[PDB]
Amino acid sequence: LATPSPFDMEKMVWLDVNILEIRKSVLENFGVDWSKQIPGPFAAFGKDFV
Amino acid sequence: NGFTVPGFITRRSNAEINVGDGQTMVISGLVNPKTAKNVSKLPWLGDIPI
Numbered sequence: 283l284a285t286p287s288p289f290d291m292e293k294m295v296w297l298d299v300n301i302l303e304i305r306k307s308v309l310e311n312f313g314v315d316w317s318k319q320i321p322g323p324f325a326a327f328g329k330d331f332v
Numbered sequence: 333n334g335f336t337v338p339g340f341i342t343r344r345s346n347a348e349i350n351v352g353d354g355q356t357m358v359i360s361g362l363v364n365p366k367t368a369k370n371v372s373k374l375p376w377l378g379d380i381p382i
Contacts, residue, residue, distance in 0.1 A: 294350070
């Protein structure tokens with residue numbers, strides 16, 4: 283004849299979460315940028331024998 | 333095309349808990365500091381004070 287409870291009282295849990303992030307960066311661009319591919323010498327010949 | 337679709341800023345909490353009659357319970361909380369710094373400078377003159 284005994285009956286159960288409508289529900290059981292559970293235990294409560296507290297959650298504490300921490301997220302930490304640090305970012306650092308450097309960027310350098312120094313100097314002189316010369317050309318590396320340049321035209322060279324040329325030579326041509328032409329003649330009419332007849 | 334002309335059908336503007338909006339974005340949202342949302343704060344949502346979906347919790348399962350149990351407490352006594354008339355008690356106040358916190359189900360969500362947040363502290364969130366953020367900082368960012370970017371610097372561009374000339375090589376040597378940028379470090380002179382003031």
